């Protein structure tokens with residue numbers, strides 16, 4: 251019930267955030283049709299020529315300090331612009347501090363549900379291509395010294411050109427329960443995350459891709475994944491995963507974080523493997539993974 255007067259905000263901060271601000275007449279949020287839902291708010295179809303967008307309605311912000319941090323995050327996120335990264339269209343703030351985050355609309359939704367869909371017919375080439383795109387997005391994000399911490403197929407999205415966008419970061423961060431099965435050994439133990447721990451998660455994402463969205467370690471008690479790994483174990487090679495790509499996954503899971511490939515090396519290696527395929531190998535679903543909850 252707290253009142254907030256927005257006119258109390260820093261003049262320099264309101265000036266610097268202008269290029270990220272969307273006018274009240276520039277945006278039409280269709281509160282009728284919900285397209286997504288997270289812990290921090292619902293996502294609605296929006297109209298921003300008229301372009302489709304995704305509008306996330308955050309919880310009403312009541313402290314002007316927290317408003318300032320929301321604006322600062324907007325400016326930084328705005329500059330995380332890359333073909334393979336979900337790229338912020340702008341931010342909106344209504345009377346009494348009702349924030350709207352405006353993102354490009356992703357026609358094909360999240361990458362995990364896309365690959366799981368039985369009506370889709372991916373080839374090895376298609377799936378490796380998606381993996382390659384994710385590596386390019388992460389290469390960019392690492393160059394901005396940004397550590398994602400929650401890289402997973404569920405957190406990447408696909409547009410109408412089948413361009414993959416690394417998403418779920420900055421103002422778009424949400425659960426749409428740490429993601430322990432995507433976490434590097436050292437992160438499970440020290441709770442610290444780096445670009446090299448993102449490379450571990452990326453290897454798990456490649457495994458998700460080649461299994462068409464199987465839950466990793468299907469029969470492993472989440473509360474014991476460190477013990478399981480320390481027995482001397484990794485995810486098995488998916489049936490339709492090429493040997494060199496499985497070799498890349500094993501590199502992503504190197505026990506020594508500094509020995510893992512950079513995203514730059516991953517883009518290079520995966521571009522080469524991708525180039526060898528012509529789209530003749532269809533990837534089918536493993537009977538033992540069908541209906542297994544994650």
Ligand SMILES: Cn1cc(-c2ccc3nnc(Sc4ccc5ncccc5c4)n3n2)cn1
Pocket residue numbers: 285286287293304306336353354355356357359360363404405406407417418419422423426
């Ligand atoms: C299962 N699932 C995962 C997501 C998701 C993932 C990352 C992520 N990073 N930002 C957002 S919000 C968003 C962004 C674009 C959309 N485009 C179409 C439909 C829903 C959309 C939702 N997301 N949403 C939504 N459902």
Ligand SMILES: [Cl-]
Pocket residue numbers: 373374375376527528529530531532
């Ligand atoms: Cl192929």
